[PDB]
Amino acid sequence: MHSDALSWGHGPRLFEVFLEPTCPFSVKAFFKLDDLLAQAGEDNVTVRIRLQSQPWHMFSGVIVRCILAAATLEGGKESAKAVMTAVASHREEFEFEHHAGGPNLDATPNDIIARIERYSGLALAEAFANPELEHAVKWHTKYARQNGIHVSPTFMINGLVQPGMSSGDPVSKWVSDIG
Amino acid sequence: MHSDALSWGHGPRLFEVFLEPTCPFSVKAFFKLDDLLAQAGEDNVTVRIRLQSQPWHMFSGVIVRCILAAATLEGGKESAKAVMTAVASHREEFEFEHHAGGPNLDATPNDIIARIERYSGLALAEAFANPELEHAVKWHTKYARQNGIHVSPTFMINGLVQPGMSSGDPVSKWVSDIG
Amino acid sequence: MHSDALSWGHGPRLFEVFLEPTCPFSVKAFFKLDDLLAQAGEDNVTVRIRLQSQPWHMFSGVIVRCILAAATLEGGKESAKAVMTAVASHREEFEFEHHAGGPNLDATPNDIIARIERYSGLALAEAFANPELEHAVKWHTKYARQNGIHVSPTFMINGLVQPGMSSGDPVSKWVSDIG
Amino acid sequence: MHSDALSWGHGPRLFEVFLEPTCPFSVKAFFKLDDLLAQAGEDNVTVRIRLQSQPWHMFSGVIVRCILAAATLEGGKESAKAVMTAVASHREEFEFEHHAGGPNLDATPNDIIARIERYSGLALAEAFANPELEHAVKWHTKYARQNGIHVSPTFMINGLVQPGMSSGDPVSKWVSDIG
C-alpha cells in the first residue's frame, strides 16, 4: 500500500496528478495543489501525487528516490512535499541544459542528495540508503505505466485520464473539472 | 525513423525485446539475441531492441542516452550494440548496491560516459551532447509506456506482449514461441 | 459517479474485478465475491465490479447495457447484481456455441432483454432505452482500456493488476493476496 | 499471425488505423484509405486496418466477425473490404438510434449476416460458423487494448498513437504526417 503516502484530503472525488519533480509544467501544477485543496475542501476531494520519472531528466531517479525517502521520515508526506518544494524552487539546478549538458554532468548522486538536504533542511542520506525504498519507486512507475502515462503532468479524476486539463488552468477550472 | 535503428534480420515475424541496459535479466536475454537470430533465421524474423529505462536503476538515463548516442556514429546499431555489450559485461559497475548505494554514489554523468567509452572503445561525449538526441530517448519511453511495458525484459511477437517468455528460456523455446 | 455504482464494503484496500457477464471464468469469480467480502471483511476492503465487454461474446453489449440499466432502478447495485446473477445462472443461454452458433443466432436484442427480465424479475426495457446510459457503458470500457484489461476476469488491488490471481483460487488466497 | 490480413502496401512507413465498422468517423477515415495509398504509393507505406469493436455499438461483435469471416474467403482482404464497404455505405442500418433503440432491437444476428450478404454479394454464414474465427476477433481486441485504443478512429504511425490526426483531415495532411 504505497498507493497512499502522497494523499491529502479524504473526500470521495479523487484527483490524481502525475508529476516529474524537475519538469517545469509539473512544477507549475504542483504549486497550484494547495489552492485546489483549499477551494474544494478536504471533505470533498482526495488529492494524490503520483511520481512520473522521465528518463530524459537524467537525475530524476535520484530526486524521485529522495522524495520517497523523505516520505519515510517523521514528517511523512509533508517531508516529501518539502523535498518536492525544495527541488521545484530550484528546478534548473536539478536538471541539464537541453537534457544534455551543464554543470550537472559533473555532479554526483551524493551531491544531488546533499543539495536537496540543504534546500529542504532535511536529513536524507540514511533514509535513501534503505533497501525497502526501491519498492516505492517501483510502485509509482508500475502504476504510471499501467495507466499509459507519458506526459508530465497528467491528470486523472476517478481513475480516468483527463486530456483537457492543463498545468496552465486556473484553480477554479480544476474545481469545476473535479465536479 | 527511431522505430527501427536497433533492428536486425529481415524476416516477417517481428520479435521485440524491451531491455534495461543494467538489469541482470535484461543482460541475460541480451546475450541470447545472437543465437536467437542464428537459430530462428534472418529470413524468418526481425529482432528489435527497445530501451526500457528503469527509474530504480539510477544511471539508466545517462546510459540509455549513451546507447542512442552510439547509434548516431558511423557504425550505427553496431556501435549501440558495442555500448550495450560494454555495459552488460560490466553490469555491476554501472548500477547501485540494492539500487541504493556503493561507489556510484560518488560518480558523475561524465564518469559514466568516460567508463562506457573505455570499455566500448567508442568516443561518445560529443554525440551525447547533441540536443536532438532527447527525441530518441523520448521515442523508446513513449513506445514502452503505450504498450504498458514495465518488467525488464519483456518480449513482444508481432506487437503482442508474451508474458510466458523469459530470459531464462532456452533460445530453442523462443524459436518455437516465435513460430 | 460511474466509478462507484457497483461497489460494496467500505474498507481502505480496493479490490477491483473486471467481469464479462457471460464468461465462464467471470461467472466463477462472480459467485465468489460474497465470500470474499465476508472473509476479507467490509471494514478492510472495498469490492468493485467493472464490466469487461468481450467482442467475441456477441450479445455482451446488450447484456452490459442491461446491467447498467438495472443500476438506475430504485434498487441500484442490488438490481444490477440481480441482473448479473440471472445471466450468470443461465450463462449458456446468453452466449453462442463456440462464440459462433446455436439458438442465439435467431434471437433479438429484445429477446435477450425479455429473457433477463424473466430471470431477474426486473423491468428493464424502459431503463434500457434511456439515451444517457451510453455514458456508463463508455465509462467501464474506457477505464478497462486505460488499464489494459483484456482477459476476463482480471483482478486489481489498489489500482494494480494482479496477473497471479485467478477465478479458480480459493477465496482464502484472495484474502491473503489482498492483505 | 492475424497481424497481417488487413494490410495494403509493403513500404517501410506503417500507418495503422483502428476502425469501428458502424462508427461515422471511422467510416469517414475508412473511405479516405484508397487515396492515401494512391498518394503515398505501395512502395512507401503499408496501411493496416485494425478492428476497434465498441461495446456501445450493440451489433459490432457480429459485424466485426463478418468482416473477419470475409477475410477467410477467396477474395481475402478484398472480401473483407467489400463487407466493410457494404456496412459503411449503409451505416445507420447496422446501428441503433442513440445506441439504444430503433428497428434493430428486433433484428437477429442471422438477420445482420443476411443483410451484410445482400449488400456485399458475399456468402458469409458458413465462414462465420468457423470456430477458429474467434482467434482473429481476439487478436484485434487484444492488440487494441494493449495499445490503449478507445476512440474510433485512432491513428498510429510506426507504432505510436497520433492524437493530432483526424478522420476530417485532407489525405494530403495524412501524407505529410506519415512523412
Short mmCIF file of C-alpha atoms in Angstrom, two decimals, chain C residues 52-56 58-62 65 96 98-101 104-111 113 128-131 134 137-138 141-142 145-146 148-151, chain D residues 52-56 58-62 65 96 98-101 104-111 113 128-131 134 137-138 141-142 145-146 148-151:
data_model
loop_
_atom_site.label_atom_id
_atom_site.label_comp_id
_atom_site.label_asym_id
_atom_site.label_seq_id
_atom_site.Cartn_x
_atom_site.Cartn_y
_atom_site.Cartn_z
CA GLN C 52 -15.33 -6.01 -19.37
CA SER C 53 -17.42 -6.40 -22.52
CA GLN C 54 -15.76 -9.03 -24.81
CA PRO C 55 -16.50 -8.59 -28.57
CA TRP C 56 -16.32 -12.36 -29.13
CA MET C 58 -21.71 -11.23 -29.30
CA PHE C 59 -24.61 -10.27 -27.01
CA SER C 60 -22.26 -8.65 -24.49
CA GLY C 61 -23.18 -5.07 -25.44
CA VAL C 62 -26.90 -5.73 -24.94
CA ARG C 65 -26.31 -2.20 -21.09
CA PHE C 96 -23.11 -18.75 -28.56
CA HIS C 98 -18.03 -21.72 -29.92
CA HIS C 99 -18.81 -17.97 -29.81
CA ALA C 100 -20.31 -18.60 -33.28
CA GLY C 101 -23.58 -20.55 -33.35
CA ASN C 104 -29.00 -17.10 -30.21
CA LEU C 105 -28.32 -16.55 -33.91
CA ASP C 106 -32.11 -16.26 -34.08
CA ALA C 107 -32.65 -14.01 -31.04
CA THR C 108 -33.00 -10.24 -30.98
CA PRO C 109 -31.80 -7.59 -28.56
CA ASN C 110 -35.45 -7.52 -27.38
CA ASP C 111 -35.46 -11.31 -26.84
CA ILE C 113 -33.85 -8.12 -22.67
CA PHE C 128 -32.51 0.33 -21.24
CA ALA C 129 -33.89 2.98 -23.65
CA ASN C 130 -32.53 5.92 -21.59
CA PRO C 131 -30.06 7.55 -24.03
CA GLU C 134 -24.28 5.01 -23.23
CA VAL C 137 -21.10 1.72 -20.91
CA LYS C 138 -18.41 4.11 -22.20
CA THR C 141 -14.92 0.38 -21.41
CA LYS C 142 -12.73 3.48 -21.26
CA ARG C 145 -8.90 0.05 -21.90
CA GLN C 146 -6.81 2.64 -19.97
CA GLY C 148 -5.09 -2.57 -20.46
CA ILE C 149 -7.62 -5.15 -19.25
CA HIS C 150 -8.17 -7.92 -21.79
CA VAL C 151 -8.61 -11.30 -20.13
CA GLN D 52 -11.92 -1.47 -32.86
CA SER D 53 -15.17 -3.05 -31.59
CA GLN D 54 -17.20 -0.60 -29.44
CA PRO D 55 -19.45 -2.23 -26.81
CA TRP D 56 -22.00 0.61 -27.11
CA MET D 58 -24.53 -3.37 -30.00
CA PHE D 59 -24.05 -5.35 -33.25
CA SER D 60 -20.32 -4.61 -33.56
CA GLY D 61 -19.31 -8.13 -32.44
CA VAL D 62 -21.46 -9.65 -35.18
CA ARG D 65 -16.99 -11.26 -37.01
CA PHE D 96 -29.19 1.72 -33.07
CA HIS D 98 -28.84 6.77 -29.63
CA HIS D 99 -27.07 3.41 -29.26
CA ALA D 100 -30.37 2.30 -27.64
CA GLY D 101 -33.37 1.67 -29.92
CA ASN D 104 -32.55 -3.31 -34.78
CA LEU D 105 -33.87 -4.14 -31.27
CA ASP D 106 -35.88 -6.62 -33.37
CA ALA D 107 -33.08 -7.81 -35.66
CA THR D 108 -31.25 -11.11 -35.05
CA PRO D 109 -27.58 -11.89 -35.77
CA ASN D 110 -28.70 -14.11 -38.70
CA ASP D 111 -30.59 -11.06 -39.99
CA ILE D 113 -25.44 -11.58 -41.51
CA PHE D 128 -18.93 -17.09 -39.79
CA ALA D 129 -19.64 -20.57 -38.33
CA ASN D 130 -15.94 -21.45 -38.24
CA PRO D 131 -14.69 -21.83 -34.62
CA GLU D 134 -12.75 -16.27 -32.58
CA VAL D 137 -11.57 -11.30 -33.18
CA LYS D 138 -9.41 -11.83 -30.07
CA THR D 141 -9.17 -6.68 -29.44
CA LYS D 142 -6.08 -7.72 -27.53
CA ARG D 145 -6.27 -2.99 -25.65
CA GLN D 146 -2.52 -3.34 -25.26
CA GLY D 148 -4.90 1.72 -25.03
CA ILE D 149 -7.12 2.42 -28.02
CA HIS D 150 -10.52 3.86 -27.07
CA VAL D 151 -11.74 6.41 -29.59
#
